[PDB]
Design a binder for this molecule. Structure first.
Ligand SMILES: CCCCCCCCCCCCCCCCCC(=O)OC[C@H](COP(=O)(O)OC[C@H](N)C(=O)O)OC(=O)CCCCCCCCCCCCCCCCC
Ligand SMILES: CCCCCCCC/C=C\CCCCCCCC(=O)O[C@@H](COC(=O)CCCCCCCCCCCCCCC)COP(=O)([O-])OCC[N+](C)(C)C
Ligand SMILES: CCCCCCCC/C=C\CCCCCCCC(=O)O[C@@H](COC(=O)CCCCCCCCCCCCCCC)COP(=O)([O-])OCC[N+](C)(C)C
Ligand SMILES: *[C@@H]1O[C@H](CO)[C@@H](O[C@@H]2O[C@H](CO)[C@@H](O[C@@H]3O[C@H](CO)[C@@H](O)[C@H](O[C@H]4O[C@H](CO)[C@@H](O)[C@H](O)[C@@H]4O)[C@@H]3O)[C@H](O)[C@H]2NC(C)=O)[C@H](O)[C@H]1NC(C)=O
Ligand SMILES: *[C@@H]1O[C@H](CO)[C@@H](O[C@@H]2O[C@H](CO)[C@@H](O[C@@H]3O[C@H](CO)[C@@H](O)[C@H](O)[C@@H]3O)[C@H](O)[C@H]2NC(C)=O)[C@H](O)[C@H]1NC(C)=O
Ligand SMILES: *[C@@H]1O[C@H](CO)[C@@H](O[C@@H]2O[C@H](CO)[C@@H](O)[C@H](O)[C@H]2NC(C)=O)[C@H](O)[C@H]1NC(C)=O
Ligand SMILES: *[C@@H]1O[C@H](CO)[C@@H](O)[C@H](O)[C@H]1NC(C)=O
Ligand SMILES: *[C@@H]1O[C@H](CO)[C@@H](O)[C@H](O)[C@H]1NC(C)=O
Ligand code: BEF
Ligand SMILES: [Mg+2]
Lengths: 376, 1140
């Protein structure tokens, strides 16, 4: 009896069930037809979507640079980017006045003096809820190799890790006390150091002469502004408030240190900190600041008070704010629609050319022993 | 190193610690590539022949410096150690299979003795030089042994040399004169004598030595080959041959023509090595771009990096650019892919497995499939031409039948050949049914001839289906029909075929006793075996001469004398006194040797008809023989015998005097008839050769056998033909010719032959012959023996010789030496830029096999001296078509497509990373969450491409045998060019551009595209956004490029994509990651995610889909059209016929 007989399976003998993917022009015409159909459909859909949302972006670096001090001068047109369908209403965007003012404010004890800008921007139509409010930072690179690994995780989680492990961690230059003493910084990275410092004071809707009272504060919240998982990442600190200090740049805010009146901010609630410490990808990123889910902003000449605390033209950067309204797709991005339409259009024109060159023009009947290249 | 041997006191001139000089190798034989004690360094140096491993080892020792990105212990050092270890494990397992069959051979038993006082059974390895040895019938010989005695007196043993030299006949060997008398097994311990020998020489038929047999004082008996039993020779017609082992180990001429299984490499590895170097070049170029741009951007006091990041990785922009350079070299490591070599090892091993488990190449009589022995080279078999072939072992089974005869001008063949069947069915005539009806006529004639024989005297020794000379006309002519004189003619002829022989007859009792015929060559064995199947069966020489049982009645012949066969005589004779009183001399031999010894001026029509019939028979591939007779006289016989025994008594120059006296009696003769014996080919060998020659392969039969048998086999196999000029390059080793005249004669022959081919070997008509792949002029053959071959392979004639051998359609070397086999293979292999297969069955064949690119052994049961050193081990020649035509073009196309798609894959990955670096001031920041990069090339994408390489097939297992011309595309090496590589890399770069800049656009050119509105523009969420569509794109491109979408391939594609989704969704549900804490619920549930997931794979696979469909329609392939044909039908006949 023969024992070395190789098993006559249908896999060992390479006989598995299969489909010989011959590209006869009854198979590729249908492929290109279905691709063109699906992609032109999705392109029309996404174009309608990216046209159903509407927004307004205003840049405000010349506030500290060149805004006037007592009169509401107009903003040049290279700052207003307003996508609003219902054009030529009683209000029209691209006409916003703006004025800066050095103001003596209080924080905990010492009443420091910051510098403010005030922007009167008019939206011409209502925008239904979930009106978000992002800030925009050009030429800011959060995506560097040393920058993106520079923080302690357990510390943000809420912990008193050590004075040694924090001292030699990947957050090298900013992990110990800048002054003489040997305290340890609470957020020990330079990713938490450079957090955006401007402060947006919610749109005070000027009197539209319907409710003629001067103030109509469209109260937008800054809570529930990040993913709940982030809240599961952070936590109030276990440090004794004795050995922690703002790293170098919260000084103009914690001008005396972490104390019983200026306490170390709990991170599970500080949601703007949670938005910042998730590192953006490009240098021209947006980030979420406020929102409102339960009431529609009406057409009106709103006014926002932007404490311009972040000196950004120092590195030729730019900063701005946007008030986009959302849809199921996202915010206004005209490019998905155009990309889908372009792919569908080229698939359609190649379908047309293939059906032509394989049905109407010469069809090159299948398998003839004339092209075999050993019959010539 | 000329050695000496002593048998019972050593020579005091080699004292203690001075006697071990003349260190003789151990009788073991190592064909394994690695020893246990030295496997590691050898295998490491072999794996590092791949240049990329140098780059990977340098990059591993470079991450130890704790300044760049990835820490050293696991991430970057586990892959190298694991890859090296699994590669070494595969190679060690393969080498151990070779080693286990090696150690199976090394334990073969031999009766050893010089210390044992008896010839106890031992193994081959236990054979020290100078130890007595006994050998029995058909025993493979352990080592080169000098004879000392044998079973029969006079010292005659027979050696079947077919394993070393392709000669079939049992060559006679003589025991040395003094010392033959040691019949016992223990009377050797008083045999005191000394042996003198010479250094080991690889020339087979040149050896000399001496013996000192110590009242005897001093003896001396030179020992040529006639005392030398070689190692592959099989001892026959002798019960015991009490020899002495003189050579052992690698001193033997059988082993002295090989290395130690020189490790072959797959010829795709080298072009792949150049491609690796080019990819490393582009890697360095892009890393230098990165370093310069990073330094330029980091040496500014105006960028936002100076303010917010207090930093520099060195107190200079130049130093930080340098650090970034090396760190980028770490990040862009996959330009020279690490996963290339392990993927290719895994693919090649699986293809070797699939070769091993194919029943379509399972030979039953030996019970083993096409077991591969080098799993690296499975793709080279898709490129080879120049299938060099042995003759005696591979092509011919070496069973010799008796087909036809021509007696009294009358032919009796009634035979048909598969050779002729193919030769006719190739043209329009006799296509299919004629074969069946003709074989039916042959069966009918066979049964009618057996019936006619039964009507004659009862023949118990005759056995149906034990006879090949079927001729009913012969039976009726011997019965008496058609003539009373023709009966006498055929009767006397069949009596002559039972008189001229020397065969020994033995009766096998039981069922009607079939008699066995032990002869000196299977030629006369077939002669006599047919001379009993038509009456006139033979018995033993019962103290007189032969006894013939003619038509049921016995006849005792006294044999007067016999003149034995020789290589120079070409004929053999015997004088016998027949019962009719008169004595008669028979002389049978070659056709052209008897036509010279014939009484002239007689039987003009008879002799011319016999000449034309032998011409027909020798053209049909049969090995003809002529028999002649002469009525000798009593006084003439006794006087010739007195001259004969007088010449025998003259001890000096005796053989020449015997040949001179024996040529005075064989001059006047007359032609009884002419036989036609056929040396049987294997099954399907003519069809195999036809199929291969249609593919594009050129087949050079180069045997070690005589010059005319080679031409016979060239006629059988249909290599030769009847419309073919013959080029016989010969420099007759004219006695004592000046050597330079040898070369001058050879040069003139080469020059006139090249002339007539209308050219010469001017070295300009070689660079135009390094780029030509065309079946040559089909009307030329080149027959050249070893001597002419030896002299045309020396300095410059070689080149000329090459050109000659390139024009002639066929080549038939003859009496060629193992070293010369290897030299011809190496001349065609190096002188041209071409691949080369060598199929063999023996020692000469092992030399030919290790020197060729692909070595195939045949398991011809002759001792696997050429199977333990081959790439593959086939059982028959007919499976070579299956192997080369199915598992060759398949494997080659598969490896080409695998490595092309693989370069594409790694290109798209690393160039997407590079574009991201472009968007972050070239400071090398991963966008892929430090685990996508870890698991990408491992899990998400490796299985689709390895499956495309292992289990993809273009046409079929049978449509490839039905259309061999497709193999031409592998001959000219058109599936792995250097434009498929560059086109695939350009494709990868384009697809990286698209598959990075589409999701980047989607989720970065807008404020937080996330539907409910939250941060998904993060550095890692964008990583998922471009890393899921990238995996789907790569697997689609690996799928679009395959031809046979089957169960496993589509299953693996689906599981790889579903596995990236599952791995994300599972790994981002815990706090352990903290960058991906919940990435699944807030990336999946978006709509831009699915929009990009469906748009980037199409936008990446659309250009090659368009190119593929158009380049199928407007321009075809050959495989394209054969698949468009075999799709509908046109090959269902072969499929249905083969499956059942
Ligand atoms: C629109 C097309 C613009 C670019 C035209 C390139 C023309 C290439 C011509 C050429 O030499 O093709 C060579 C190959 C295409 O051969 P194939 O039969 O499909 O290979 C399948 C394989 N034998 C298999 O079946 O397994 O070529 C390839 O395999 C890949 C190259 C095709 C183009 C790659 C994309 C570049 C696009 C850049 C602009 C967009
Ligand atoms: C044998 C396994 C060896 C694994 C070693 C290994 O690290 O995988 C390697 C290949 O390894 C393979 O491709 C083996 C694939 C075999 C099939 C596995 C499929 C599982 C499903 C993959 O290594 P890599 O992903 O190319 O490493 C890149 C790291 N870098 C990007 C930082 C330079
Ligand atoms: C580590 C595993 C090594 C397996 C070694 C092995 O036996 O491979 C085998 C299976 O091979 C396979 O089924 C695939 C194994 C994975 C790829 C090979 C290992 C990576 C290199 C290859 O089988 P084979 O060599 O084709 O069979 C030889 C037949 N013989 C046993 C008579 C010689
Ligand atoms: C909001 O954030 C921005 C950016 O983080 C922040 O602007 C920063 O203020 C810090 C100081 O609080 C600046 O750092 C200084 O830079 C100057 C110039 O290089 C240095 O001379 C300063 O060193 C002196 O002062 C230190 C502090 O007393 C001493 O320790 C030191 O010995 C020196 O005497 C100091 O390093 C930083 O440059 C700016 N950033 C930019 C971009 O200009 C802003 O103040 C923040 N506002 C609030 C309210 O948090
Ligand atoms: C983390 O690394 C820093 C840098 O090496 C370590 O530095 C220094 O730590 C000592 C020990 O507390 C500090 O000294 C205290 O300094 C005051 C001077 O104001 C001195 O009067 C006290 O007697 C005491 O020595 C020192 O100021 C501090 N210097 C700096 C620049 O940080 C630090 O100790 C490391 N952390 C730990 C936990 O070890
Ligand atoms: C969105 O803004 C509107 C602005 O009116 C908020 O409505 C006011 O909410 C406050 C409490 O936060 C009430 O005291 C006022 O009486 C409300 N005014 C009106 C006219 O309704 C609304 O609460 C905000 N909602 C969200 C989700 O932020
Ligand atoms: C605020 O409190 C801190 C400590 O409690 C004190 O040192 C500081 O002087 C206070 N502010 C003012 C303006 O005095
Ligand atoms: C918005 O509502 C909060 C909660 O009552 C309140 O503290 C805040 O002053 C309001 N905003 C304005 C501009 O009044
Ligand atoms: F012994 Be062979 F036919 F080279
Ligand atoms: Mg052989």
């Amino acid at each position: 009896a023969p024992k070395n007989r190789p098993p006559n399976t249908a896999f060992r003998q390479q006989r598995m069930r299969a489909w010989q993917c011959v590209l006869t022009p009854k198979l590729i015409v249908t492929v290109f037809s279905i691709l063109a159909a699906i992609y032109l459909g999705f392109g029309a859909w996404l174009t309608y979507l990216a046209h159903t949302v509407r927004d307004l972006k205003i840049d405000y670096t010349d506030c500290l640079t060149s805004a006037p001090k007592d009169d509401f001068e107009t903003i040049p047109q290279n700052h207003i980017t307003a996508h609003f369908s219902a054009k030529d209403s009683t209000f029209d965007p691209y006409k916003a006045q703006w004025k800066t003012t050095e103001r003596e404010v209080q924080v905990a004890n010492y009443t420091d003096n910051r510098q403010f800008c005030i922007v009167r921007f008019n939206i011409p139509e209502d925008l239904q809820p979930t009106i978000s409010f992002f800030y925009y930072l050009e030429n800011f690179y959060q995506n560097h190799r040393r920058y993106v690994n520079s923080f302690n995780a357990k510390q943000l989680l809420g912990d008193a890790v050590d004075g040694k492990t924090i001292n030699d961690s990947t957050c090298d230059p900013i992990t110990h006390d800048p002054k003489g003493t040997g305290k340890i910084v609470y957020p020990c990275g330079l990713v938490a150091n450079s957090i955006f410092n401007d402060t947006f004071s919610s749109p005070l809707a000027l009197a539209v002469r319907n409710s003629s009272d001067s103030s109509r504060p469209y109260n937008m919240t800054t809570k529930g502004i990040a993913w709940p998982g982030l809240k599961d990442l952070y936590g109030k600190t276990s440090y004794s408030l004795d050995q922690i200090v703002p790293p170098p740049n919260w000084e103009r805010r914690y001008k005396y240190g972490y104390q019983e009146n200026n306490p170390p901010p709990d991170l599970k609630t500080d949601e703007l900190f949670q938005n910042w410490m998730m590192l953006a990808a490009a240098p021209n990123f947006y980030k979420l600041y406020q929102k409102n889910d339960t009431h529609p902003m009406l057409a009106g000449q709103y006014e926002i008070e932007i404490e311009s605390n972040f000196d950004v033209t120092v590195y030729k950067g730019r900063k701005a704010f946007v008030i986009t309204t959302l849809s199921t797709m996202g915010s206004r991005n005209i490019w998905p629609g155009i990309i889908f339409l372009i792919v569908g259009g080229i698939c359609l024109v190649l379908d047309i050319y293939f059906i032509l060159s394989f049905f109407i023009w010469r069809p090159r009947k299948l398998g003839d022993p004339s092209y075999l290249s050993w019959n010539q | 190193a000329p050695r000496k041997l002593y048998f019972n006191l050593p020579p005091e001139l080699k004292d203690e610690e001075g006697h071990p000089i003349q260190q003789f190798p151990r009788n073991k034989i190592r064909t394994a590539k690695y020893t246990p004690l030295s496997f590691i360094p050898k295998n490491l140096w072999f794996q590092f022949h791949n240049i990329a491993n140098i780059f990977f080892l340098f990059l591993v020792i470079l991450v130890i410096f704790p300044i760049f990105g990835g820490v050293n212990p696991g991430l970057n050092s586990v892959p190298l150690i694991v890859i090296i270890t699994v590669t070494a494990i595969k190679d060690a397992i393969e080498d151990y299979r070779r080693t286990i069959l090696d150690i199976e051979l090394n334990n073969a038993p031999v009766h050893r003795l010089s210390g044992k006082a008896r010839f106890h059974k031992d193994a081959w390895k236990n054979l020290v030089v100078g130890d007595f040895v006994r050998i029995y019938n058909d025993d493979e010989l352990p080592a080169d042994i000098i004879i000392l005695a044998t079973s029969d007196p006079d010292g005659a043993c027979y050696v079947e040399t077919k394993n070393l030299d392709g000669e079939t006949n049992l060559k006679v060997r003589q025991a040395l004169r003094c010392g033959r008398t040691l019949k016992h097994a223990r009377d050797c311990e008083r045999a005191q004598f000394v042996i003198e020998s010479e250094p080991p020489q690889p020339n087979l038929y040149k050896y000399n030595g001496a013996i000192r047999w110590k009242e005897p004082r001093e003896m001396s008996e030179p020992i040529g080959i006639d005392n030398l039993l070689l190692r592959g020779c099989h001892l026959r017609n002798t019960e015991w041959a009490l020899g002495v082992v003189v050579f052992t180990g690698h001193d033997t001429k059988i082993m002295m023509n090989a290395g130690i299984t020189p490790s072959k490499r797959a010829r795709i590895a080298r072009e792949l090595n150049f491609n690796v170097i080019c990819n490393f070049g582009i890697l360095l170029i892009m890393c230098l771009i990165a370093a310069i741009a990073n330094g330029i951007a980091w040496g500014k006091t105006d960028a936002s990096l100076a303010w917010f990041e207090y930093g520099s990785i060195g107190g200079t922009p130049a130093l930080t650019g340098f650090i970034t350079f090396w760190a980028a070299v770490i990040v862009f490591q996959n330009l020279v892919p690490i996963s290339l070599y392990i993927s290719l090892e895994i693919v090649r091993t699986l293809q070797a497995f699939f070769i091993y488990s194919d029943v379509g190449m399972y030979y039953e009589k030996i019970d083993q499939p096409c077991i591969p022995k080098s799993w690296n080279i499975s793709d080279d078999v898709g490129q080879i031409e120049y299938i060099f072939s042995d003759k005696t072992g591979t092509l011919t089974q070496n069973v010799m039948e008796f087909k036809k005869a021509t007696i009294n001008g009358q032919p009796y063949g009634e035979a048909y050949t598969e050779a002729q069947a193919g030769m006719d069915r190739r043209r329009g005539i006799n296509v299919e049914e004629e074969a069946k009806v003709i074989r039916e006529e042959i069966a009918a004639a066979k049964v009618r001839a057996i019936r006619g024989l039964r009507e004659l005297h009862d023949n118990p020794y005759l056995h149906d289906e034990d006879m090949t000379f079927i001729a009913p006309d012969f039976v009726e002519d011997l019965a008496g029909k058609n003539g009373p004189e023709q009966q006498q003619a055929t009767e006397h002829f069949m009596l002559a075929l039972a008189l001229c022989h020397t065969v020994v007859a033995e009766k096998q009792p039981g069922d009607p006793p079939k008699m066995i015929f032990k002869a000196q060559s299977p030629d006369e064995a077939a002669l006599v075996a047919t001379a009993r199947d038509m009456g006139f069966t033979v018995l033993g020489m019962s103290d007189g001469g032969i006894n013939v049982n003619v038509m049921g009645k016995d006849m005792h012949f006294p044999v007067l004398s016999i003149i034995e066969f020789n290589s120079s005589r070409k004929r053999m004779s015997t004088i016998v006194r027949m019962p009719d009183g008169r004595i008669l001399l028979f002389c049978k031999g070659a056709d052209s040797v008897i036509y010279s010894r014939l009484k002239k001026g007689e039987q003009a029509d008879m002799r011319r008809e016999t000449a034309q019939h032998l011409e027909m028979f020798a053209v049909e591939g049969l090995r003809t023989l002529c028999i002649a007779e002469r009525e000798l006289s009593e006084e003439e016989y006794r006087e010739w015998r007195r001259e004969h025994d007088l010449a025998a008594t003259a001890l000096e120059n005796r053989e020449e005097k015997l040949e001179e006296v024996a040529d005075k009696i064989e001059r006047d003769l007359t032609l009884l008839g002419g036989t036609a014996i056929e040396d049987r080919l294997q099954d399907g060998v003519p069809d195999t050769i036809a199929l291969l020659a249609d593919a594009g392969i050129k087949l050079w039969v180069l045997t070690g056998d005589k010059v005319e048998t080679a031409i016979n086999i060239g006629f059988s196999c249909n290599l030769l033909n009847n419309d073919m000029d013959l080029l016989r390059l010969q420099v007759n080793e004219s006695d004592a010719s000046t050597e330079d005249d040898y070369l001058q004669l050879a040069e003139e022959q080469l020059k006139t032959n090249l002339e007539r081919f209308n050219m010469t070997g001017d070295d300009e008509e070689l660079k135009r012959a390094r780029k030509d792949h065309n079946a040559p002029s089909p009307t030329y053959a080149l027959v050249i023996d070893g001597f002419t071959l030896r002299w045309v392979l020396s300095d410059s004639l070689k080149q000329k010789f090459l050109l000659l051998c390139k024009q002639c359609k066929s080549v038939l070397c003859c009496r060629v030496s193992p070293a010369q086999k290897a030299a011809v293979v190496s001349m065609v292999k190096n002188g041209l830029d071409v691949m080369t297969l060598s199929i063999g069955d023996g020692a000469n064949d092992v030399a030919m096999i290790q020197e060729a690119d692909v070595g195939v052994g045949i398991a011809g049961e002759e001792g696997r001296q050429a199977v333990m050193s081959s790439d593959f081990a086939i059982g028959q020649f007919r499976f070579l078509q299956r192997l080369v035509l199915v598992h060759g073009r398949w494997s080659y196309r598969r490896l080409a497509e695998t490595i092309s798609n693989f370069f594409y894959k790694n290109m798209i990955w690393t160039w997407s990373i590079f574009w991201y670096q472009c968007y972050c001031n070239f400071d090398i920041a991963y966008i892929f969450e430090y685990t996508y990069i870890l698991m990408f090339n491992l899990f998400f994408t490796s299985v689709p491409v390895i499956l495309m390489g292992v289990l993809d097939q273009d046409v079929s297992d049978t449509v490839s045998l039905a259309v061999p011309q497709l193999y031409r595309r592998g001959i000219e090496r058109k599936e792995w060019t250097q434009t498929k590589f560059w086109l695939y890399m350009i494709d990868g770069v384009y697809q990286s551009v698209m598959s990075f800049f589409i999701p980047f656009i989607f989720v970065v050119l807008t404020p937080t595209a996330a539907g409910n509105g939250l941060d998904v523009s993060e550095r890692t969420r964008l990583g998922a956004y471009i890393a899921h569509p990238a995996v789907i794109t790569i697997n689609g491109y690996i799928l679009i490029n395959t031809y046979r979408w089957d169960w496993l391939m589509l299953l693996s594609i689906v599981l790889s994509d579903v596995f990236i989704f599952f791995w994300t969704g599972v790994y981002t549900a815990t706090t352990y990651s903290a960058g991906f804490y919940q990435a699944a619920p807030q990336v999946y549930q978006e709509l831009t995610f699915w929009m990009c997931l469906i748009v980037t794979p199409a936008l990446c696979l659309l250009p090659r889909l368009v190119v593929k469909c158009i380049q199928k329609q407007r321009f075809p392939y050959d495989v394209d059209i054969i698949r468009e044909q075999a799709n509908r039908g046109d090959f269902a006949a072969a499929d249905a016929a083969a499956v059942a």
